[PDB]
Amino acid sequence: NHHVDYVIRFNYGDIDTPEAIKKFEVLLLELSEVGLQTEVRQLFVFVRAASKKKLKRAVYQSRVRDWLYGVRNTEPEPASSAKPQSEAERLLVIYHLITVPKPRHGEWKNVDAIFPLHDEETNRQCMREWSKKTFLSTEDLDRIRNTFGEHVGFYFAFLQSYFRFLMFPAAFGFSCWLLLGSFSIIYTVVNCLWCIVFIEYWKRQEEDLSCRWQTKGVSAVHEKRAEFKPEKEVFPATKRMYRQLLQVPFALLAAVALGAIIATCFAIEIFISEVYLKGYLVFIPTILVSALIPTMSAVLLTVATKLNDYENYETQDAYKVALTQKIFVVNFITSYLPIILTAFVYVPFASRIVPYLDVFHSINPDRLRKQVIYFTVTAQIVGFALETIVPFVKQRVFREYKEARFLTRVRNEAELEDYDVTDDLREMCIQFGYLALFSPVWPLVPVSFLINNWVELRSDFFKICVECKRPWPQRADTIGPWLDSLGFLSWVGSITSSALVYMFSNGHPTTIRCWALLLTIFFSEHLYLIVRYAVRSALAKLEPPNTRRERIERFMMRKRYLDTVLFWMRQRGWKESAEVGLSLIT
Amino acid sequence: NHHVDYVIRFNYGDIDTPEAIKKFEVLLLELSEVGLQTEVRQLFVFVRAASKKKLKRAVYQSRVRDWLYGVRNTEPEPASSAKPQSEAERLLVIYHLITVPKPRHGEWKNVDAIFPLHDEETNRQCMREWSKKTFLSTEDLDRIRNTFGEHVGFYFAFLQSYFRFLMFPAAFGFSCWLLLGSFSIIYTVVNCLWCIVFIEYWKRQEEDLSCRWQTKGVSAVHEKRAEFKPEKEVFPATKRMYRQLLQVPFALLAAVALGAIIATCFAIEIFISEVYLKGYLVFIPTILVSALIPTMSAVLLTVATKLNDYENYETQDAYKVALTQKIFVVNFITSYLPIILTAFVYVPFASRIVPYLDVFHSINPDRLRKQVIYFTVTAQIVGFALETIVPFVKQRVFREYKEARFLTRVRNEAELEDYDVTDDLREMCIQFGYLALFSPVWPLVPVSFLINNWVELRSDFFKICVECKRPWPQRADTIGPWLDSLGFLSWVGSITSSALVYMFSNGHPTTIRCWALLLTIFFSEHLYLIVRYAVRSALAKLEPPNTRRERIERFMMRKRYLDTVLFWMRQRGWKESAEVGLSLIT
Ligand SMILES: [Ca+2]
Ligand SMILES: [Ca+2]
Ligand SMILES: [Ca+2]
Ligand SMILES: [Ca+2]
């Protein structure tokens, strides 16, 4: 409430003369458009829309272009009475007012970046209300729509829909851990059948909440594209397929590196499990894995980054897509292959090739029980520490080294990080996987996410408020690539959790491959397919109310543009038909 | 060219008084709407739109309702200058003018049905031109759009796209039958990879040809629905899921009957293959299969018909859908299970249980080679006879028993059958299957459809012209359920044609199940999946021109409805920014 929208910082990295040039040339553009760019020399500059007669103009100017691309799909209210209907929506148009051509933030200019600010009065409110309820409401959800954009709004709406459906397995796995032993064939059915229903609910659910927030985002921006065929009314999109061809050996190259290194670190802990500072030597492969694969994957980001900027790349969203998918092959290997080696080569066999060893440098049954505890329970607790508490003490301590209340405030706003939805969402999609792939080992697992996600929903909202910078409102119509990638994940969980039940069916080469390890895959996994065919088509028929209301609303709109703009036959019709009709008597 | 659109026949099945009532009560409705219902007592009646000032009204009245449901998606030309732009389109509106409520054809009235007529001048033209070309053109395709409706138009456009892509396997299988033996692992790859590309081309192709013909059909009619909740602005659609639940044991009941009977008939021919009028006894299981399963399946139509009319069933198209899918489970069993028993139980084993027999009533290698010849080549030739030649001699001979040139013509028009696209399309989707499932046996198969489909395209067009009645123009936006069912078919072909290569890998219990029959399924069939994931997403990115032009055209239309209807900050903007901007020196 201080008449300010964005800050725009600078460099101090060059000589004084073109910095004097490059400061006012970007100021003159904002002179041309926005106005009242007030600056206070750190340099940064405050930016606010100058006149309401311009502000009411451009919001209408957005809501026109938002309409006639087929997104708003209503009649836009005319330019006289255009209320902004939100706060972040008002702060959205300013960002498209600045960032557009005809002002590149991260490149080509001296600016680091552009950030909006928080509302510390209502943010200290928003915690303490729904820190009390069981799980929060739509009237609280829309507060995270009217602020924080709409891409963040899916993230809580994904999480809330993921929260109130974990109450069904965590109740059920509570029973089989109490009634049965582990590995009950009743449990793995209720595991896998649940995972189909959650996705196909959420695929139906995104159609509502994007309709309810008036968004089908199909037009964001172009950048850096270099336009190898110029037209002003563009590039052969086949050459994407020629260069997405090159995307394939990346995954094997990430497989051959990180698959080797983790298994190399997996090889050593079995060696010390057999060939016994000895206890200090136990920590060594955990030390070796904890220092290489954060670095070695950080190499592989730079490769995929160097891959992803090959193409012209006309959009803005698909870079966030294409970088996510190429990062996702790393996250799949480095967070599941620790379990798969214990499950698939360590306990069935490998006893066989335990005498292959490093001299130059007996099956433990609880390797599985211990390590799945280490991933699904304990790693969230230290993940609760490394995400939240570590940057908070870094925010407070490093504050202490280095009308004027804003410049105390705004400079400490510049200290923080930007928020990424995707980097916080990838810890959710991975932690979905331990439920999908290794719930039959120790079936108290969905409790451990249920207790997590009630806290993680409150913590990640707290993480956005004070421990990182204000995200500018980006709009979206789905959760990105994560929806398509999530169904692939539970597909694999149909294979493994089927096989994992049989190999531990009271015991265990020892068990038959011919009769039971492959039929129990082929029967089960092809039963996972057809139930997914059943429910995906079933919930499509039950249409939800908003997308019916949207389809009604485009019908009623086209009613307006209609209405606002706008040789012998001798029967003489009717009477002589009575005479020929009377000829039915014969 | 005789000023006539439809004929409407009658019953002569009741007493004379309500027939006098029921004739004029349906005449009075047409008196209210159409006019000039001229009748000639067989009784039937000719129907033509009376005044052009009504005809130009109702075509505009269609093109309004066709527009504001979001199908036409253009501006409708106003009611003054509405040219019908076709012939069948003019004859389409008349059918919706008659059939609608506020005149049931097959029920509730004395009428058998309603039929339009042919144009024997141009139909004798249309054959002799494209009986000459290699394969016909879009200017000839649109002639089958401007007549015969648009649902028939997909059928040739499906067939033509299926014709000019058979030239690639029939060239390739010509090589491996000449170069290799059968069962070459190179051939089964080029078989299966082709089957992915054809579907995902045609899934992309329907988006063009429906756009090019201005059709996204989502509003046809309601009928017979009984409306168990009445509202005038309806039924809990969940009770469909309660009654599509009951649709599941139908398929097993069709499986347990016809799977037994065909295998029972399959059991007997092996008995005579081992236990030797003896040659007249050979024909007996072929006689037993040729008389029971046409009758036994004809029972199962009546069951699925009695199933399909359980629900309220609000649409018109989905009955043609839901009857097709429930008939399709019969067609899958009764036309592939003859081969699968020879392939999967006869040659791998069963030598084992050949001494189980009917006393009370040695492996032949060429059972497979003979029977696949009997299905993919010879059955088309007798299928060429039973479809075309048998009703034609039934048309001419039974004509000879039982200004007045029309009543010679029109009465012989009433002799014929209605045309079904679906009943003629199901012989195509099945004969796709022999290519998909059993092409590695005798790889000259895709030649035998290539030679077929050049003839079958010409014959089925001839079948519609003279040997069955004129189909009224029905509109559609796809080929119905057959597209979704076709991808399921080639899915199964990934399983069988993989396994069929290994079991015949130069020889053959004998071959290992453990090491090679199940890994060669699991490796291959899950490689069929991901290539289908590759191409389906690849051809989506390469957008075709018409659906880009459609998206442009809805953009430019919404341009018209837009345009036709329509506190300390003290820098003083720009100048004093030069002084504070000069403070970069420090
Ligand atoms: Ca966390
Ligand atoms: Ca978190
Ligand atoms: Ca035929
Ligand atoms: Ca035919």
**Please, is B495 exposed, middle or buried when counting C-beta atoms within 10 Å of its C-beta (0-12, 13-18, 19+)?**
middle
Determine the residue among A11, A15, A584 to mutate to test chain B binding: the one whose Cβ has the most chain B Cβ atoms within 10 Å.
A584
CA angle B446, B331, B302 (to 5 degrees): 155
Cβ neighbors of B73 (< 8 A, separation 6 or more) are B67, B214, B550, B553, B554, B557
Partners of B20 on chain A (C-beta within 8 Å) are 581-582, 584
In this complex, which of A31, A43, A519 lies closest to B574 when CB atoms are compared? A31
Counting every residue written for chain B, the total comes to: 586
Q: Mapped to the 3 state alphabet, what secondary structure does B501-567 carry?
A: HHHCCCCCCCCCHHHHHCHHHHHHHHHHHHHHHHHHHHHHHCCCHHHHHHHHHHHHHHHHHHHHHCC
Query: Nearest CA to CA, how far is B114 from chain A (Å)?
Result: 18
Query: Nearest CA to CA, how far is B472 from chain A (Å)?
Result: 23
Residue A38: phi and psi, rounded to 5, are -95, 130
Asked if residue A94 lies in contact with residue A47, where contact means CB atoms within 8 angstroms, the answer is yes
| Domain extent for B196 | 1-586
Partners of A241 on chain B (C-beta within 8 Å) are 538, 541-542
Residue B127: closest CA among B115, B112, B144 = B144
Asked if residue A262 lies in contact with residue A337, where contact means CB atoms within 8 angstroms, the answer is yes
For the sheet with A44-47, list strands across it: A38-40, A44-47, A6-8, A114-115
Cβ neighbors of B47 (< 8 A, separation 6 or more) are B4, B5, B6, B7, B8, B30, B34, B36, B37, B94, B98
d(CA A150, CA A209): 10
3-state SS assignment for residue B47: strand
DSSP conformation class of A584 = G
Asked if residue B516 lies in contact with residue B502, where contact means CB atoms within 8 angstroms, the answer is yes
CB burial of B324-359 (b: ≥16 within 10 Å; e: otherwise) equals: bbbbbbbbbbbbbbbbbbbbeebbbeeeeeeeeeee
Asked if residue A265 lies in contact with residue A289, where contact means CB atoms within 8 angstroms, the answer is yes
Cβ neighbors of B576 (< 8 A, separation 6 or more) are none
Cβ neighbors of A309 (< 8 A, separation 6 or more) are none
d(CA A122, CA A562): 46
| Contact (CB<8Å) B31/A566 | no
Asked if residue A234 lies in contact with residue A273, where contact means CB atoms within 8 angstroms, the answer is no
Residue B547: closest CA among B536, B539, B537 = B539
- Other beta carbons within 10 angstroms of residue B509's beta carbon come to 9
**Please, is A582 exposed, middle or buried when counting C-beta atoms within 10 Å of its C-beta (0-12, 13-18, 19+)?**
exposed
The position carrying tokens 């659906």 is B547
Output the six-digit token pair for A573.
């019709």
- Residues of A within the annotated binding site for Ca(2+)? 387, 424, 427, 456, 460
Cβ neighbors of A409 (< 8 A, separation 6 or more) are none
DSSP string, B426-440: HHHHHHHHHHHHS-S
Amino acid present at B190: V
Alpha helices (runs of H) in B147-277, residue ranges in sequence order? 151-163, 167-178, 185-212, 238-244, 248-274
DSSP conformation class of B75 = P
HSE-CB at A259 with a 13 A cutoff on CA atoms is: 9
Give me the number of domains chain A comprises: 1
CA of B473 to the centre of ligand 4 (A): 20
| Contact (CB<8Å) A571/B39 | yes
d(CA A84, CA B471): 56
In this complex, which of A43, A78, A571 lies closest to B566 when CB atoms are compared? A78
d(CA A207, CA B96): 34
3-state SS assignment for residue B39: strand
Cβ neighbors of B378 (< 8 A, separation 6 or more) are none
Distance of CA B54 to the CA centre of its chain: 35
CA distances from B552 to A34, A308, A316, A559, B69 (A): 32, 29, 21, 21, 18
- Other beta carbons within 10 angstroms of residue A418's beta carbon come to 12
Amino acid present at B54: K
Determine the residue among B38, B242, B510, B553 to mutate to test chain A binding: the one whose Cβ has the most chain A Cβ atoms within 10 Å.
B38
Nearest residue of chain A to residue B28 (CA atoms): A574
Asked if residue A43 lies in contact with residue A10, where contact means CB atoms within 8 angstroms, the answer is yes
Resolution (A): 4.1
Asked if residue A114 lies in contact with residue A469, where contact means CB atoms within 8 angstroms, the answer is no
Residue A542: closest CA among B235, B40, B171, B229 = B235
